[PDB]
Symmetry: D2
Subunit: 429 residues, 4 copies
């Protein structure tokens, strides 16, 4: 299937192939003068992928309000039709992460619907941070770390169910993020709470296929505003080290304390082989979940700088699971995921342009200036031509968001899907 | 009328009377040694009030979920009943802060309900951060500073409506907080948006009654995640200075950047007569909206230190409006509000024990240590006996939450309000 | 007796009647809550925190340093001042030394300590500033410097600190370094850490059987982009890699804005890697302000974790308590005196927590009463206990006051010359 | 000429050919975008940023300082080093002096400056550290000190700074103080601020008609609890209270974590009180790192505000640009060279922003395209424009590379004595 009319793609691409040729040829000539074959970079770029969050093709909100756009996806199947667009146009998101029970549906259908749309399935995402209809036990005071054995068991039961559904759709991992924490001093005993969590997580580990991975994800706060059981990579690490070889750490860029050097944390987890994967997005204040690289692009480059360095240093057995974890509250969800996904590839490409040998040289002789400049020369290089050409050759659009608006897709699904109503967000009932 | 049976309050008070006498008298003995009449403090304490927020009477939540308890208030009228409990037991919340359209109801009836319940109404809170049913223009991209004239006109009109309702219930102020901002660089033109906002607030100021005040409330972020038109007290001051004398700044404790010295911002505003009021709550990470004092009680005391100091220095016409802006996601909203209110009186109480003569002296001699230590001798004093005696003398409960749970009130309203 | 016994006496007498009233009032009040003020005072009496030798002198910032009168000229002077603090508070029997700032003949240090009734806490190495003669500079690092020769020299200095430590009775080595980078790309994170790990292992080898090696993390400063030991997570990896004797030292002001510090303490305790603390208060960065002066509640919440571990019966849990501060605008001695009191104050209040009730409210997810349970403890003015504790052990009911009355500062001011160049 | 003309020429001819390729490529790409590359280059050529006399010397922290070789000592060595920066970058024709640090005979300063091809930017008073002989200490504050005489001394010093300034061609006086407190209660916030506003009025009077007075805010350091001029809010209160000649100065690293700095800029511009900037970068606090070495996009966003100010043709908008960094682990010159380069880059890119389309996407609340419109400019490698601008004005294609080729560091190292060989 083709969510976008192939003629629209070819059309809009042809309307740009002229400029693209110039820019590309000019950049390839520059990189050439720098001992780099723009063709090897491009080659690698077309093969780099990140997963799109199913809960991301819909409009997000805040506790204060939600302002839905038009043609909002009604369910998981609609959401899949949308991601198919992002993939067709960028060729960088051939996989979708699901959230249960949100995208709960007949596995045969999901798998079937994806095969038609040319989409696969990334890591399963359990949900014990909200109560579903008929749920016997509330998650108000926690889930996997709740003081009630029955509630923890139910929480464990859910994650287990998530693994079955994923096993059936082709998923190879389970990411566990919970809001388990406390809003007040004394409310929780940090130790007992964690101990409970570790044990509960241990039972989930048993139900993990032999070729699967369990990813735990840390966050400093929200929904818990005083303490969070899985608050930082430190704790996260302790979890991965305890659970077993199949348990790794998930790093969501916007979940760190103000000014945290996030790229070091990536390196530390890589060092001890516990970097399960990422959750790309950007922010300025807290867990803002903004478009990848929209606020701090250099930071995103520095995170990939560690990733490429490991990739280059022959770090055997290093295939992190990349995913986009964003909330689009004031833009078309599709356009954002499209560009956020491209910004990720931009960062990657620039990281592949760094003179690794020259860098080591400067690090070794403590030449701080040239070291940081060595990185900058790569970051400064406008890799758009490479990202564009990569898309074109793989059958994507030279200019993704442009082709999309020209295809009219939004007005289209908008005419097929019911109208959404703007409402509160959760600060009150 | 009394939401809580008077016989239960009396019972629960006699039960603790003996102890309170012991503690109060020991405290009086201690304070007299420090040359402080415990009586004069109790006298001022039972006169300190702070209004409860209607939107805090029910369980709040986050963008990730909302976990309601039992007997949640069905509407504004339910909320007023629960606010009546809070006032009956603490005698510190004789007023309620409403939000329109959230609490929209017939002014005449709200007024009626309030009078019967012994409650009054504090500043009105306009709501142009969310779309009301039927609304012509969406506030998705802003309100008072929206690029589209029609949307700004609609925003202005909403606030003017808010003024009409409040005039009707005995309210004398309009607090304006908006989420206007941008989530991306370039998405907005900082100055132009601000210019629009000022122009829009100017119109509201124009329709403001002359026995009313206009409070603007700054916030660093949320809902906007890159820029916010009214981001800090700097922008806020510009705003109030421009609008006129009836427009002041409202300080919400959790709306500041990390490590910000908030008490200083409070002094500065008083110095330039632009401190309209507070939105009390506590926090640790962002605008957490936690019970006041539950995270940083000392920070709360320092804010009150500036309030009590202003009165000491002689500042005139300073009567900031005290309000509680909290969200209670995992506790009985009512019990939370009860202690938050008490905690606020606690900070005020201790700030009144500060020997200003001694303090001033150490400041002049640059004796930093004795200076800081002078504040600490006040803050370290357990003033609970004074807070309890004050409630006891004014019809309240020695142990508010204790008497509340003994009333089984929550079980009662949970039966009257199917879930 | 650095302070005349009659001064201490006279001053205690003048305040005896009030201490009696407040103490007995607090005793009654506490008795009503099922707490033995007596049992608390007795425990408070035995809570000791080590004073840093480098804190008894006026500290400064990169912009300036405003010394006071009577600044100590050397380690022996500092010890004399440390004895003033211990005599009056009775909460600081030990002193933490810094090599090479305090380097001196171990036998004289030991003798001056014994004579003053002072012992020596953990030894602190210094490879964050060059010393004269140094064959290699620590500009670009020390234990993790790219140059092996530089790392060797850092390792040697640490072993040397151990030797000095053994002679004066010390039982641990604390290692804090500025090693890091100010520019992205300057250092290869992983490689700099492997180097450090390799260097620390060697130091570990030189540890006595009854010694411990403490690694202290810090988010930034002097490194402004990356610090090798940046947070408790990296710190944990170090403790776990080096061995049983290796633990983590937590300095309150070394964390990112808003970091829940008490949790980290809880985490290290659970995994047996809580070596000790460096107490001090802060508001913006590693301010090193007097403990409890800014956030007294946070201090109490850290101690709540400390007292709870005891309550859970964690075995082999004996963390090293030390005060790590800089006093830039007060009399170093007066600040350390009160900082010591604030900590005993936090500790005291932690002991007043009705944990049986706390455990109840926690299990019942009664968040409000839970938090309220801690507050009942924290809101108690424990000063009478701290003062009575001092009296019974020969300290001053009002330390700073007795110190001012003794004219000590003025005395040492007339005895010590100010540094001119 | 500090650096040899044949070296510059040599290094430039060496890179001139490839520069041509890149430059013509950008002019091409910028043409298909509707931009005249030669228009940008002409403006870039005239973008100047003052160089701090204290920046040419290796910086340090409260823990240590590792001076490099050939350290300039005394204002004269310093001017000689700043001259290297101006010659190779051509973007720093003027120097900011700090009194008393660079105190000397005005006539000789002015004389030495013309000899080197340097002017003198705003004067910088210093009442945050005590100088030898000083009657009163600034330990507890200067312009806001509680002691009248201490404040008179500060006023007078600043006034002296204006006189030194008038004699060398300076037109403004920047006033940054450490004044604040480290403990709650120590200072009475309002009273201290009143004493400061009163003293500042005194200085204001000494300002010539064309002279301006810049006050600089800082969240913390050296004060660790509260600072008199803590934020831009207080700053504004000061500038609008002292008068038309007094404006606010904004040092990028003096803001609370996560603060939106470019917005503060806008707000001040709109109100005619943006006196100028102090460029540098940070990640934690006032790290005072090389501009754009940490968050280059933020530098651009600040500059996007500065450039838009030109277009909207704003009034009273004439910001004094100064670099205020501290180089602790690199050659002070090389750093200042690339910092001044990074600043021009920001400017160059902000200048490529299609204001028309931007404003278009703003009114339509088309946020994604709006942000993408900024990304199109910022994403453009404007180095070819930077090098070309340098080449046309007598600068070097690759400043640091030419600097290194000139072997200048080694030269001054041989002329100036270190502390140790
Ligand atoms: O904040 C929550 C984390 O980003 C999790 O990955 C979460 O599952 C995601 O936001 C979708 O719910
Ligand atoms: O962040 C919101 C501010 O605190 C406002 O006062 C708001 O109206 C209040 O929180 C109600 O939601
Ligand atoms: O920030 C530095 C840490 O406090 C270290 O413990 C340091 O060695 C101490 O301050 C003494 O210099
Ligand atoms: O003294 C160095 C500089 O650093 C300070 O933080 C301020 O930026 C001020 O400009 C001062 O002159
Ligand atoms: Mn995530
Ligand atoms: Mn940042
Ligand atoms: Mn998130
Ligand atoms: Mn508020
Ligand atoms: Mn804090
Ligand atoms: Mn709020
Ligand atoms: Mn320390
Ligand atoms: Mn420290
Ligand atoms: Mn500056
Ligand atoms: Mn600075």
């Amino acid at each position: 299937e083709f969510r976008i009319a192939q003629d629209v793609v070819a059309r809009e691409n042809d309307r740009r192939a002229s400029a693209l040729k110039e820019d590309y040829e000019a950049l390839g000539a520059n990189l050439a003068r720098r001992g780099v074959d723009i063709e090897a970079v491009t080659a690698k770029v077309e093969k780099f992928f990140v997963a799109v969050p199913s809960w991301g093709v819909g409009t997000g909100g805040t506790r204060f309000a939600r302002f839905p756009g038009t043609g909002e996806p009604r369910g998981i199947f609609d959401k899949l039709d949308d991601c198919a667009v992002i993939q067709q146009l960028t060729r960088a998101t051939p996989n979708v992460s699901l959230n249960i029970p949100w995208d709960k549906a007949d596995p045969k259908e999901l798998k079937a619907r994806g095969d038609a749309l040319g989409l696969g399935f990334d890591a399963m995402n359990s949900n014990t941070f909200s109560d579903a209809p008929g749920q016997a036990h509330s998650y108000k005071y926690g889930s996997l770390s709740h003081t009630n054995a029955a509630t923890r068991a139910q929480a464990v039961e859910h994650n287990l169910e998530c693994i079955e559904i994923g096993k059936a759709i082709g998923s190879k991992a389970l990411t566990v993020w919970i809001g388990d924490g406390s809003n007040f001093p004394g409310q929780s005993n940090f130790t007992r709470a964690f101990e409970r969590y570790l044990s509960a997580m241990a039972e989930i580990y048993k139900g993990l296929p032999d070729d699967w991975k369990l990813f735990s994800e840390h966050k400093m706060y929200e929904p818990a505003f005083y303490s969070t059981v899985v608050q930082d990579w430190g704790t996260n690490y302790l979890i991965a080290q305890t659970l077993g070889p199949k348990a790794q750490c998930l790093v969501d860029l916007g979940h760190h304390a103000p000014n945290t050097n996030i790229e070091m944390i990536v390196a530390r987890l890589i060092q001890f082989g516990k970097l399960g994967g990422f959750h790309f997005n950007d922010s300025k204040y807290g867990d803002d979940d903004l478009d990848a690289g929209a606020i701090e692009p250099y930071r995103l480059f520095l995170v990939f700088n560690e990733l490429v360095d490991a990739e280059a240093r022959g770090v055997k057995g290093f295939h992190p699971a990349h995913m986009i974890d964003q909330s689009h509250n004031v833009t078309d969800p599709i356009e954002s995921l499209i560009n956020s996904a491209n910004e990720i590839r931009r960062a990657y490409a620039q990281a592949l342009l760094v003179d690794r040998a020259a860098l080591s040289g400067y690090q070794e002789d403590n030449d701080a200036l040239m070291a940081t400049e060595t990185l900058k020369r790569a970051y400064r290089t406008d890799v758009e031509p490479i990202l564009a050409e990569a898309r074109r050759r793989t059958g994507g659009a030279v200019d993704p968001v442009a082709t999309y608006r020209a295809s009219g897709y939004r007005a289209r699904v908008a005419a097929e899907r019911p109208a959404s109503v703007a409402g509160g967000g959760g600060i009150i009932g």
